[PDB]
Design an enzyme around this catalytic site. Sequence first.
Site, short mmCIF file in Angstrom:
data_model
loop_
_atom_site.label_atom_id
_atom_site.label_comp_id
_atom_site.label_asym_id
_atom_site.label_seq_id
_atom_site.Cartn_x
_atom_site.Cartn_y
_atom_site.Cartn_z
N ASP A 72 97.48 32.85 45.35
CA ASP A 72 96.89 31.66 44.78
C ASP A 72 98.00 30.72 44.30
O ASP A 72 99.18 31.08 44.25
CB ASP A 72 95.94 32.03 43.63
CG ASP A 72 94.90 30.95 43.35
OD1 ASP A 72 94.91 29.87 44.01
OD2 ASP A 72 94.08 31.18 42.45
N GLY B 255 97.51 27.56 39.21
CA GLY B 255 96.93 26.71 38.19
C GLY B 255 95.64 27.25 37.59
O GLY B 255 95.41 27.11 36.39
N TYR B 256 94.78 27.86 38.42
CA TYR B 256 93.58 28.50 37.89
C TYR B 256 93.95 29.48 36.79
O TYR B 256 93.37 29.46 35.70
CB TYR B 256 92.78 29.23 38.97
CG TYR B 256 91.63 30.06 38.39
CD1 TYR B 256 91.82 31.39 38.02
CD2 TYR B 256 90.37 29.50 38.21
CE1 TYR B 256 90.79 32.14 37.49
CE2 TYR B 256 89.33 30.25 37.67
CZ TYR B 256 89.54 31.57 37.31
OH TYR B 256 88.52 32.31 36.78
N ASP C 89 95.64 23.14 42.99
CA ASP C 89 94.43 22.40 42.66
C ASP C 89 94.14 22.52 41.17
O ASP C 89 94.84 23.19 40.41
CB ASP C 89 93.23 22.96 43.43
CG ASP C 89 92.91 24.41 43.08
OD1 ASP C 89 93.84 25.17 42.74
OD2 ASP C 89 91.73 24.78 43.16
N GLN D 291 86.83 21.02 45.85
CA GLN D 291 86.33 20.96 44.48
C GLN D 291 85.11 20.05 44.44
O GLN D 291 84.51 19.79 45.49
CB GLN D 291 87.44 20.53 43.52
CG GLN D 291 88.62 21.51 43.46
CD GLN D 291 88.28 22.81 42.74
OE1 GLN D 291 87.26 22.91 42.06
NE2 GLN D 291 89.14 23.81 42.89
N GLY E 270 86.22 26.19 42.42
CA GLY E 270 85.38 25.69 41.35
C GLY E 270 84.07 26.42 41.16
O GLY E 270 83.21 25.91 40.44
N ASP F 6 88.04 37.28 47.28
CA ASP F 6 88.91 38.04 46.39
C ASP F 6 88.23 38.13 45.04
O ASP F 6 87.53 37.20 44.63
CB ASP F 6 90.29 37.37 46.21
CG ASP F 6 90.28 36.27 45.14
OD1 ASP F 6 89.92 35.11 45.44
OD2 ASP F 6 90.64 36.57 43.99
N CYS G 281 79.49 57.23 50.66
CA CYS G 281 80.85 56.72 50.71
C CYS G 281 81.78 57.71 51.39
O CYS G 281 81.72 58.92 51.14
CB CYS G 281 81.33 56.45 49.29
SG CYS G 281 83.02 55.87 49.17
N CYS H 95 85.14 57.58 51.16
CA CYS H 95 86.46 57.55 50.56
C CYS H 95 86.92 58.96 50.18
O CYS H 95 86.13 59.90 50.07
CB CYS H 95 86.50 56.61 49.36
SG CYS H 95 86.12 57.31 47.73
N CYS I 139 85.21 60.56 47.09
CA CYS I 139 83.86 61.07 47.31
C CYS I 139 83.84 62.27 48.25
O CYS I 139 82.88 63.05 48.22
CB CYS I 139 82.96 59.95 47.81
SG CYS I 139 82.68 58.69 46.55
N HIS J 195 87.97 54.62 44.65
CA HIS J 195 86.62 54.58 45.18
C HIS J 195 86.10 53.15 45.26
O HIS J 195 85.51 52.75 46.26
CB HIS J 195 85.67 55.44 44.35
CG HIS J 195 84.25 55.09 44.61
ND1 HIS J 195 83.56 55.52 45.72
CD2 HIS J 195 83.42 54.24 43.95
CE1 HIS J 195 82.35 54.99 45.71
NE2 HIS J 195 82.24 54.21 44.65
C1 LIG Z 1 86.74 34.56 38.95
N1 LIG Z 1 86.37 33.21 39.36
C2 LIG Z 1 87.20 32.38 40.00
N2 LIG Z 1 88.45 32.66 40.34
C3 LIG Z 1 88.93 31.49 40.94
C4 LIG Z 1 90.22 31.22 41.41
C5 LIG Z 1 91.28 32.32 41.44
C6 LIG Z 1 90.98 33.37 42.51
N3 LIG Z 1 91.54 34.69 42.23
C7 LIG Z 1 93.01 34.72 42.16
C8 LIG Z 1 93.59 36.09 41.87
C9 LIG Z 1 93.19 36.60 40.49
C10 LIG Z 1 93.79 37.97 40.19
C11 LIG Z 1 95.30 37.95 40.31
C12 LIG Z 1 95.72 37.45 41.68
C13 LIG Z 1 95.11 36.08 41.98
C14 LIG Z 1 90.47 29.91 41.83
N4 LIG Z 1 91.78 29.60 42.23
C15 LIG Z 1 92.04 28.32 42.52
N5 LIG Z 1 93.28 27.96 42.88
N6 LIG Z 1 91.10 27.34 42.46
C16 LIG Z 1 89.79 27.55 42.12
O1 LIG Z 1 88.98 26.63 42.10
C17 LIG Z 1 89.46 28.94 41.79
C18 LIG Z 1 88.18 29.26 41.36
C19 LIG Z 1 87.91 30.55 40.94
N7 LIG Z 1 86.82 31.14 40.34
CL LIG Z 2 97.81 32.94 40.51
ZN LIG Z 3 83.91 56.89 47.29
#
Ligand SMILES: CNc1nc2c(CCNCC3CCCCC3)c3nc(N)[nH]c(=O)c3cc2[nH]1
Ligand SMILES: [Cl-]
Ligand SMILES: [Zn+2]
Lengths: 356, 356
Positions: free
Chosen positions: A80, A83-84, A127, A174, A201, A251, A289, A291, A294, A320
């Site tokens: 990623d 910024g999030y 973003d 967005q 978003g 993810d 499962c 895995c 299990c 798991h």
């Molecule tokens: C949980 N909800 C959510 N996550 C968003 C995320 C992050 C996604 N997961 C990243 C991982 C988190 C664990 C560590 C490794 C990176 C978003 N990321 C960005 N850049 N923009 C979003 O609008 C954006 C929107 C998101 N909404």
């Molecule tokens: Cl990140």
């Molecule tokens: Zn399992």
Amino acid sequence: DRPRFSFSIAAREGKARTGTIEMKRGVIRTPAFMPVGTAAGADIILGNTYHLMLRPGAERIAKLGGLHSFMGWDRPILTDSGGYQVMSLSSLTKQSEEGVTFKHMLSPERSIEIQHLLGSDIVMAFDECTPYPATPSRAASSMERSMRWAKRSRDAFDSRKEQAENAALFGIQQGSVFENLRQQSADALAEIGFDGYAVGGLAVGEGQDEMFRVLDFSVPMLPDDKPHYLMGVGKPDDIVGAVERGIDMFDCVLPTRSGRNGQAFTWDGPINIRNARFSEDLKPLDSECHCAVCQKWSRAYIHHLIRAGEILGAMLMTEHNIAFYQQLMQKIRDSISEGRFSQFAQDFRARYFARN
Amino acid sequence: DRPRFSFSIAAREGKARTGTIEMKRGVIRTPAFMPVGTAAGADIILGNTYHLMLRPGAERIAKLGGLHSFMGWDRPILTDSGGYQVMSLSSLTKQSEEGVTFKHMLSPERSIEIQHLLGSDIVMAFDECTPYPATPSRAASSMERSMRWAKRSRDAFDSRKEQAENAALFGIQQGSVFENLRQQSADALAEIGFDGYAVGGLAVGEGQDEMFRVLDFSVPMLPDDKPHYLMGVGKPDDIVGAVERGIDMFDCVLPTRSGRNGQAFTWDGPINIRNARFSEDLKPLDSECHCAVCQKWSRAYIHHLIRAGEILGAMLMTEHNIAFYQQLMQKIRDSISEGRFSQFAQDFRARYFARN
Ligand SMILES: CNc1nc2c(CCNCC3CCCCC3)c3nc(N)[nH]c(=O)c3cc2[nH]1
Ligand SMILES: [Cl-]
Ligand SMILES: [Zn+2]
Ligand SMILES: CNc1nc2c(CCNCC3CCCCC3)c3nc(N)[nH]c(=O)c3cc2[nH]1
Ligand SMILES: [Cl-]
Ligand SMILES: [Zn+2]
């Protein structure tokens, strides 16, 4: 020799698609679940840009040979843009048209450079994940800034020869819950041009009904011939419904977070393994499962380990959960390929929500 | 078909011995390190009588099929008799000739019955681990009670047909640091007759020099033709010196405890992987170790995981530490068998204590 990036759709059912992304470091089967790499099979894992830029720092990761060498993973890595997580985790933040300052600076250019130093294969544009709820004016201003930042991200990525020739760049749509803003964002991203398109978003507190409503109109706005990535989603039923709406990639920290907190995913819904009702349950975590957990151990033993504070318990739960998510994605891919995904989704929900 | 119990010495060097214990569920190569079973190869693991009798209870373990089924381990299991841990962990204790009451009762008969319900293969007599330091009078009274309890343990074990025919019983020598009391204890245990003999009452705060001094005279008092088990030992250098003094079997929480606390064992001594000096160290935890962790990941990555609070870090450390202990035991067995154990012990100490 695999191309830098090539997405091919092998089969479709309604809005759902199944296919493959080919990249230099491997093939990604879609719909794909992309677990965090530090979790413990997946075709691609996520690095943690926000954490890595602070510890040990992106320059240090590059000095150690990049994230593939560092983590012992030679297949694709997605990062990623940071910024999030800055907006969710940082103590204080200062936002401007240049980027975000926090206690370090992140801009489109610096985010792309950090992701280059980490060596990731799929790079996200930098973003702004608009908070929810947002007024139309605030959602519009935020989306407009994100689109300017998407162009800056594109240019920074294209300026780094090794990155432009070997990695791929995804833009992030967005616009909050507003159809007109989602359309303007999709149009702006397609005009710039990206290898894939994320729906940003969402999963920000709006709930599943609203998320699905936004996906209903937002995913068709993205180019059909490129992958669609729903960021931060989600629970198994979120994933199934998002695939029904055209999403190809996911993810979420949930399988890993749940595993460290006593929650196991099963085809009959989640279970809290610490509950006393599992103390004598000789069945595996899930009786379908495949895995390694299990195949070998019972709910009763995993319950025992977790209740004793043994790290082994949380690791077995996490193994798991990650495997369950991959089996879910495999069943999704097979059912789309076989033209029975609608039936799978109906059967999945009936059993998952019965909680038997 | 393997016998219930048969110990054979294949080679000797000084007081050190190497050989095998044959039992129905498998062969144990000696000198042996016996890790705790809930840790994560070993020929035998330890169950936790004290914990299991409280959660979920010995009757419940038996209802679930015994500890082998419960833990998914079909090879030998050793259990302690529970009193050492009662005296170390219980909030309050009341001791009498009958046994110990705590907040549950443990007596020789109840300890043997619990170990029967757990289904362990090597059963320890119920003893009293004399505190250190102890006066001669107190050490004598305690040892005398332990010997009466050893006879009661013998009788309880012999009364349970399935246990007498399929498991083995070890007696535990006491006597603190006093040669005459150690001799009286050895004589009493040999008169009762056991399948193996443990040296109890050490690793209780006396330090290595004193422990070795007591082993110097105590191990030769035990029957030569039966295994010698040093309870609760220990660090790698403790193990090497104890083998030099005739010990065949060891258990210690150290590899597992250290792994959950940032300490890794190496041939150059222990290292604390959290220290900043490992943040850029691309070498494996140990550059001779053959474990799966050292084949794949660097100190730098394990450091990163631990510092991030990732459970994976502690598990990789524990897997390495357990494997290191087994490699130590393999090197000990090979060197005794080859007549080069004295040289191995000298080389081991020179490198381990240099801390390079
Ligand atoms: C949980 N909800 C959510 N996550 C968003 C995320 C992050 C996604 N997961 C990243 C991982 C988190 C664990 C560590 C490794 C990176 C978003 N990321 C960005 N850049 N923009 C979003 O609008 C954006 C929107 C998101 N909404
Ligand atoms: Cl990140
Ligand atoms: Zn399992
Ligand atoms: C650490 N030092 C030490 N331990 C001793 C122990 C316990 C050995 N370890 C048991 C395991 C601990 C982890 C859980 C599973 C059981 C001793 N046990 C007994 N019965 N008698 C001792 O004199 C006796 C003496 C000991 N000295
Ligand atoms: Cl115990
Ligand atoms: Zn190792």
